[PDB]
């Protein structure tokens, strides 16, 4: 079985409604062998609906299943900030072999928020081991798209930085990002100024947080 | 009624791996058992499952790569004969999959890599009185160079949860993981309140409590 969910992502404000689609290649068993699962980050999948429309035990009535045969839909009324998750449909043609859809990510909408930028020098304890990790935090912003550029004495850094963004917050519906600039002890103490330029929608100009080595 | 997976570990590519599903509170013979997996940041995939009679089914791609059977009166196994890097995933076992009698296990993490297990180094991301965004200080810990996943990080033995952000780990070019955990706290309490991050990497038995101060 091949089930396809389109689109891959759907959005709503805290309180709105989203529609998650699921098309099968051919008709599922008895025209209604289709279940919906919810997976929040870290947790195992939570079964919400089965038999196309039947709510699972204890699941809210906000989740509505509808469809038959090949086309199906998961509607989520009154979206909570807590609904940030990936939803998968589950289908079968002969009731034995199952298949999950690609998943649909649920983005909770909110007003734009510029990131709070913080820069962190490498600890003297790390420098003892012979490496220098310079971290730059962008805290609680929306939407997700953000850009970080490192500069060491006005020299653009490239290839030596990795970043990580958290999932959409379950309460404030913001994102956060941490960029790590990794140098050797040799290269770190040959320069002075370490800057972190942040570009974001909520910002009018690219804000820079920086520090001087040995100060 | 509950299930649990066992056997999740670091395996080298090509070496046979066997995962086990132990059940409790119900007969293994009464309900059908399924195996599902999930690569990091990817979607759920049904591998296969066994019915009440004993017959076994697999997904189209999983034919040959996976072998499922009952190994005990209380167990169901999943042997991957020649593991590859593509098989790195959290493997789930579940009673059923569809009906209301469905119960999943917590999942077991398989890392297919030829790399060795390694403990993290914990460093502080120290704050300052003069780099604070509007009466709000940010502090944290950098958990660097460990393998494999996962590591857990709490603050103040779980007593600090508000404003804490534990970032997803990044796989470095060295093949080692590295993550940070940050927390925004009152700036006036930087001198009066203590902030400790609790790092635990169970694959290496590394438990570290790190105080972060300005």
């Amino acid at each position: 079985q091949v089930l396809t969910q389109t689109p891959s992502s759907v959005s709503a404000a805290v309180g709105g409604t989203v529609t998650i689609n699921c098309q099968a290649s051919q008709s599922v068993y008895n025209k209604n062998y289709l279940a919906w699962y919810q997976q929040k980050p870290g947790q195992p999948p939570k079964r919400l609906i089965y038999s196309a429309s039947t709510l699972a035990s204890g699941v809210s009535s906000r989740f509505k299943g509808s469809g038959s045969g090949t086309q199906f839909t998961l509607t989520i009324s009154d979206v909570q900030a807590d609904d940030v998750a990936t939803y998968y449909c589950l289908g079968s043609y002969d009731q034995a072999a199952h298949a999950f859809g690609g998943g649909t990510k649920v983005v909770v909408e909110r007003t734009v928020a510029a990131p709070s930028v913080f820069i962190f020098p490498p600890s003297d304890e790390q420098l003892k081991s012979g490496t220098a990790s310079v971290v730059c935090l962008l805290n609680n912003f929306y939407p997700r798209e953000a850009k970080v550029q490192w500069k060491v004495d006005n020299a653009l850094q490239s290839g030596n930085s990795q970043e990580s963004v958290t999932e959409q917050d379950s309460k404030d519906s913001t994102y956060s990002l941490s960029s790590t600039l990794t140098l050797s002890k040799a290269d770190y103490e040959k320069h002075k100024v370490y800057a972190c330029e942040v570009t974001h929608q909520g910002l009018s100009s690219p804000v820079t947080k920086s520090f001087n080595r040995g100060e | 009624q509950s299930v649990e997976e066992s056997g999740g570990r670091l395996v080298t590519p090509g070496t046979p791996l066997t995962l086990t599903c132990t059940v409790s509170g119900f007969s293994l013979s009464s309900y059908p058992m399924n195996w599902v997996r999930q690569a990091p940041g990817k979607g759920l995939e049904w591998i296969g499952g066994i019915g009440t009679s004993g017959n076994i089914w697999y997904a189209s791609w999983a034919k040959g790569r996976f072998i499922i059977s009952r190994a005990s009166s209380t167990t169901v196994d999943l042997k991957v004969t020649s593991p590859t890097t593509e098989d790195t995933a959290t493997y789930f076992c579940a009673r059923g999959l569809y009906n209301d009698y469905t119960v999943w296990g917590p999942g077991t993490l398989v890392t297919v890599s030829s790399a060795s297990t390694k403990g993290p180094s914990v460093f502080p991301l120290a704050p300052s009185s003069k780099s604070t965004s509007g009466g709000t200080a940010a502090l944290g810990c950098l958990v660097k160079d460990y393998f494999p996943e996962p590591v857990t990080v709490s603050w103040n033995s779980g007593a600090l949860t508000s404003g804490v952000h534990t970032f997803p780990a990044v796989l470095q070019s060295s093949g080692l993981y590295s993550l940070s955990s940050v927390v925004t706290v009152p700036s006036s309490s930087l001198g009066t309140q203590t902030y400790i991050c609790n790092v635990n990497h169970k694959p290496s038995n590394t438990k570290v409590d790190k105080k972060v101060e300005p």
Binding site: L90, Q95 | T52, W57
Partner: peptide, 6 residues
Amino acid sequence: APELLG
């Protein structure tokens, strides 16, 4: 074959 697995 086949039979209910879910």
